Design a protein around this ligand. Structure first.
Ligand SMILES: Nc1nc2c(ncn2[C@@H]2O[C@H](COP(=O)(O)OP(=O)(O)O)[C@@H](O)[C@H]2O)c(=O)[nH]1
Length: 125
């Protein structure tokens, strides 16, 4: 369960959390979301978490075609949250390797990267 530490900027939130723009920690049940202020707490209304989200669904492409299949449930939950929500599939680990669901969200594009060096970055719109 969650502990949400809310208050205007400057109130003591971060210093209080002595107890042990958004800072999510685990406090050893074991609980902590620490919000800098008003703007940051507003941003996490469920409306925004579901409806103003652009998703990168990232998978490791060198395990095979069961990790494009471990991903279908992600794509199904992404759809449960909001069914119009854009998704960009990215398989990583191109450098190390020898399928793409036409129920699923609006899959915007799909890339094959080596996530480790410069060569997607513009498709992110
Ligand atoms: N060769 C190669 N290694 C990668 C690539 N992407 C991630 N890695 C490595 O694989 C591991 C994956 O870790 P990480 O980036 O933390 O994965 P995360 O759990 O999804 O956040 C790291 O050691 C990376 O150095 C890639 O595209 N190519």
């Amino acid at each position: 369960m969650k502990l949400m530490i809310v208050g205007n900027t400057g109130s003591g939130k971060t210093t209080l959390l002595q107890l042990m723009g958004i800072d999510v920690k685990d406090w050893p049940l074991v609980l902590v979301w620490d919000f800098a202020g008003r703007e940051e707490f507003y941003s996490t209304h469920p409306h925004f978490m579901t409806q103003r989200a652009l998703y990168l669904a990232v998978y490791d492409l060198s395990k095979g075609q069961a990790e494009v299949d471990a991903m279908k449930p992600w794509l199904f939950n992404i759809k449960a949250r909001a069914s119009s929500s854009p998704v960009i599939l990215v398989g990583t680990h191109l450098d190390v390797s020898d399928k793409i669901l036409l129920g699923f969200p609006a899959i915007r594009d799909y890339h094959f990267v080596n996530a480790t060096e410069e060569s997607l970055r513009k498709t992110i719109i």
